[PDB]
Ligand binder design. Structure first.
Ligand SMILES: CC[C@@H]([NH2+][C@@H](C)CC(N)=O)c1ccc(Cl)c(Oc2ccccc2)c1F
Ligand SMILES: CC[C@@H]([NH2+][C@@H](C)CC(N)=O)c1ccc(Cl)c(Oc2ccccc2)c1F
Lengths: 642, 645
């Protein structure tokens, strides 16, 4: 679907009124066709997807808005879908060529400290500028007042644009400031190229540089290129988030380029003294990061990956590389932030229908589609993998489930099989398949600053973004004609990750890699500050402050929850420690808290709740000191998407 | 818009109960079908996944009737093969609606055997085990987050043999987790089918020999409050007519003296007369201030505008219903032009014209031409005080005699008389009784709703929502009275009539404490009589909860209460109470909104964090949760609480 214009705020002292020009039916058809024949007027446009509605402000002949709402989408236009002219994911900014009849605001030259934010409801909210991207609302307003107004103009008194609104800065649920994209970030974006070629490795520079490599898996981004570099006489470290891919490079380089390299995973380590090393991000962090002098080039493969280990690992490289004597970091991926899924020559795509013997996410799979051969069916949860493997086995199709927890030996590597897997597949198994069938959804975590009492980590089923869809489809069609069947044809924008991933990085830091919160921050600071990487909201101060107060955890609990492989082993363990000290029962008796099961006779009363990590069945008390500290931490300034 | 079928849930054939979903329509197909009311796609399966524009849920055919919940479907028609099917049963009291099952749609069959191990099917095709605790209740064997169940209302509850016990309609929560489920019994679906499909209420009832509560569903024009009470009086009966509006009450009495003959008793705060006549007109507020029914006085009590869900009206009707048989009345009539489940039908005096973007005056995203409002007397309904004053401002500058009206301002600021454009909120409707040449409607309104947000307690949020069938009808009803009328509107939509929020239950206890010296226990009795009387607007039963909250709010400062009372704002007790607690800790209020003006004078002696009891708006000050009243309220949030899904 395309972004659709559904109305306009007309600007006129500054005042405004809004005008609606479409309803739901129209918005839906227009988004599907990409064809909008309505006459565009005004400088601010009310726009909408099938999900969110928001704004777009025309400046200098470009119509601008936020990446978090528009993604990389085309805008419906008179001739047809308009492709985006600019896409600056780093600045939460995208932009289309202004259609005829649109007026443009001209940039604010002088720069008043006094500024007015136009909202989607046609209000003109005064704002005092505090910095380049920061203004304080004269009247603190609830956060929900500003919702739907991402992409709206901030104006000086004369009516020239100072920037477009991108996020509220909340203090305990009330908006006291605003983050906007400066007009000078737009003029900078208009002066960068629309075509920077990243498909070739850079040549090694005289001094330190970070460089980007965009090219598909198989192209030898991970094999040929490190070899080429080794030939020129350099030492190269290749980081990867999969144990199975890292190990498989070992026997691959030996066969193919006569280099018997160093391999470093948690399960296995080989030192051959080769000039090339392949390691997981995880083993890299276990070994303390960059060793003084050991490497010239550090290639971070699958840098589109937004799990906590990769992020923490990449930001370690970026914080340490130059001081360890690196001259080159290369961030490598086939799917950088802002990518969309384009057709693939080797892959035929066929929507699923309702005609099929096997139900699947409201559609159907025909037995004939998966009876012969090797097939990969992605499902969102383990529960659903178990269900589908059971049905298929019961019809005599040779079927097998794989997800986090299982050994990859459930395999089966040669012969007929239907593999029903979660995304864990993409890290534990390196093989390709005759067809891929994709449910087009994933499970994700989201933090919610719910103040009940502190924060919550919700697990939610969500639509897949452009990176998931591409990575899943790319398990077929690798040098051999593949089919890709799907339940649904859309895809969310790529390259954004949630604040809970940040939280996960402190947790793993503390739990797994002996990092203080201060230390975790510095490495995340290096990641955030590097252009072209995935993006998130800057909630570092906040998570640092939270984990900073979580002291004298109980070793036994920590170990146990690490060994069960829970998410957030540190937060779970820490809550467990507080409970067992306070002589109080845990939030519930979910598996999550099994680590406390032998104290169940003696633990009684209300749970000293620190935060919410699932359903809380027990009564709660807010009197524990750690709770009060975490409550106090919620007064910090939180950027929120609006 | 119609309800559209967009998928189904196929139950298994044998062995253990299991199911899977089939999706038959996307969003685009769903909207088109809803707007045309036409659905040529055939219908298999007994459990349909159904949607509206705004939401989606389930329906379960049993005995040839496709049943769903009223809170989901309202009174809407079902998209069918030869166009929209109208509802056959609309049992608002039971949260139960029903269409005739379309061609070859298959139907579950009722729990013949009667077991107590149950299985709930959800929209995801999951199959939760449930233990029957009562006629209409069941506990989850493994409790669950209430969000798991969203979108499954309408879904069936099966016994092991595959037979339908009931349909899911609500989660019973404790602090965010669903311990239980409420469903509509299958035998409520048979009580429903075993009755007339059409019941009449168009005529005033005959006076029964013994106590009976009747409904009078009739236009404001049939003379619900003049003719019908005169007629009863003409036959020698003592009649009390209650009404929410002081203006309407005085008007009826004045009309009765000049028209139907006699000089009735009037009872309002601003005016009271005891003539000794046998008709008495009163407001619900004066009636409650007077302590309700005093025995022997009346044979018939007409509760006019019984569709109103302001707190006084509900608290009023609840009193009459608790007290009237024991006070010797023979008849309680519940009168309204717009009863629960009613739809806005067309009016022969009234031309209904969609606003467009063509026009000089912006109006909620559309536009009004000045042509349409210079020629005569017109009424513009706006949602806020703000928009009202803003739009007076614009119109008058354009050479129009416009005046704002809302709560606080004085009626008769409306010229009587002149040639006018009055810009008003719904306050118009209880403030002023005149009609107009045309009504212009924004089709939205401000309402309050409660959020059990546990942060630390609950939150009363004010929001703007689309108007319901009752709102549209009453607003439009201010033109086309006798003469010709024109109704112009921004949106054609209309939410289901007859449902009110738990926050309205909150205001009842609040008003009982602030205005009518009713302990919470006494308020619960009165509210209970209301919930239990059929054919009145419906709510979720949060009575124990709210009673328990207000029972803790003891020793309020009289002085603050009297100010929040006079200032006329919502929830004077909760506001006075929070301010009371704030003043006794020498702490500030949650913010300095106008809500808290009673504490401005103490500003310089108030310091530290606010001991927050509950959220009635933005909280700007830092908060402490250690006050004993906060803790007492936190304990109250462990009540069993019905919530919809
Ligand atoms: C413009 C700020 C930028 N964040 C900085 C910390 C830079 C960085 N390394 O991410 C940013 C860019 C793009 C988007 Cl969609 C942003 O907002 C969100 C919102 C929700 C999820 C993820 C990002 C954003 F916050
Ligand atoms: C079947 C329960 C019934 N409530 C009882 C207290 C009876 C009564 N007098 O209301 C009921 C009927 C209809 C509906 Cl839409 C119900 O659910 C809601 C949901 C949200 C708002 C209002 C009512 C309901 F809860």
């Amino acid at each position: 679907g395309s972004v659709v214009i559904v109305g306009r705020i007309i600007l006129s002292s500054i005042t405004a009124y809004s005008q609606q020009t479409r309803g739901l039916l129209g918005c839906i058809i227009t988004s599907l066709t990409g064809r909008d024949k309505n006459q565009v007027e005004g400088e601010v446009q009310v726009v909408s997807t099938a999900t969110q509605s928001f704004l777009a402000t025309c400046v200098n002949g470009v119509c601008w808005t936020v990446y978090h709402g528009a993604g990389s989408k085309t805008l419906a236009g008179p001739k047809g879908p308009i492709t985006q002219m600019y896409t600056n994911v780093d600045q939460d900014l995208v932009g289309w060529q202004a259609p005829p009849g649109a007026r443009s605001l001209t940039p604010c030259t002088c720069g008043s400290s006094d500024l007015y934010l136009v909202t989607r409801h046609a209000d003109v909210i005064p704002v005092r500028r505090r910095g380049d991207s920061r203004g304080s609302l004269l009247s603190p307003r609830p956060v929900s007042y500003l919702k739907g107004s991402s992409g709206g103009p901030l104006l000086c008194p004369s009516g020239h644009a100072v920037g477009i609104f991108r996020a509220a800065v909340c203090t305990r649920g009330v908006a006291k400031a605003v983050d906007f994209v400066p007009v000078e970030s737009m003029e900078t974006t208009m002066r960068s190229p629309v075509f920077t070629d990243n498909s070739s490795p850079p040549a090694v520079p005289q001094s330190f540089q970070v460089a980007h490599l965009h090219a598909p898996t198989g192209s030898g981004k991970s094999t040929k290129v490190p070899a080429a570099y080794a030939a020129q006489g350099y030492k190269v470290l290749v980081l990867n988030p999969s144990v199975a891919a890292t190990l498989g490079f070992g026997a691959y380089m030996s066969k193919a380029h006569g280099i018997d390299p160093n391999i470093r995973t948690g399960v296995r380590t080989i030192t051959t003294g080769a000039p090339v090393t392949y390691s997981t991000y995880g083993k890299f962090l276990a070994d303390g990061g960059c060793s003084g002098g050991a490497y010239d080039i550090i290639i971070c493969d699958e840098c589109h990956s937004t799990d906590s280990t990769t992020i923490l690992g990449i930001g370690t490289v970026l914080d340490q590389a130059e001081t360890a004597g690196a001259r080159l970091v290369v961030l490598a991926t086939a799917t950088p932030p802002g990518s969309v899924t384009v057709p693939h020559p080797n892959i035929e795509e066929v929507a699923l229908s309702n005609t099929g013997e096997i139900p699947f996410y409201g559609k159907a799979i025909p037995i004939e589609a998966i009876r012969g051969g090797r097939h990969l069916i992605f499902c969102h949860s383990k529960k659903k993998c178990d269900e589908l493997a059971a049905k298929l086995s019961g019809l005599g199709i040779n079927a097998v489930a794989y997800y986090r927890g299982l050994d990859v030996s459930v395999i089966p590597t040669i012969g007929d099989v239907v593999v029903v897997a979660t995304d864990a597949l993409m890290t534990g198994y390196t093989g390709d398949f005759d067809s891929v069938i994709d449910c087009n959804t994933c499970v994700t975590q989201t933090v919610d600053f719910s103040l009940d009492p502190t924060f919550t980590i919700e697990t939610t089923t969500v639509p897949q973004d452009a990176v998931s869809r591409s990575q899943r489809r790319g398990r077929t069609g690798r040098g051999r004609r593949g089919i890709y069947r799907f339940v649904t044809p859309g895809e969310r924008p790529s390259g954004m990750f949630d604040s809970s991933v940040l939280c996960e990085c402190y947790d793993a830091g503390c739990a797994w890699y002996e990092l203080t919160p201060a230390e975790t921050s510095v490495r995340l600071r290096a990641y955030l500050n590097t252009p072209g990487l995935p993006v998130c909201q800057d909630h570092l101060e906040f998570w640092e402050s939270v984990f900073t107060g979580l002291t004298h955890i109980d070793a036994h609990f920590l170990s146990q929850t690490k060994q069960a492989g829970d998410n957030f082993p540190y937060l779970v363990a820490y809550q467990a420690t507080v409970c067992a000290r306070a002589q109080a029962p845990p939030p519930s008796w979910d598996q999550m808290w099994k680590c406390l099961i032998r104290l169940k006779p003696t633990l009684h009363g209300p749970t000293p709740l620190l935060y919410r990590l699932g359903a809380v069945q027990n009564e709660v008390t807010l009197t524990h000191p750690i709770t009060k500290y975490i409550m106090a931490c919620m007064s910090a300034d939180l950027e929120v998407v609006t």
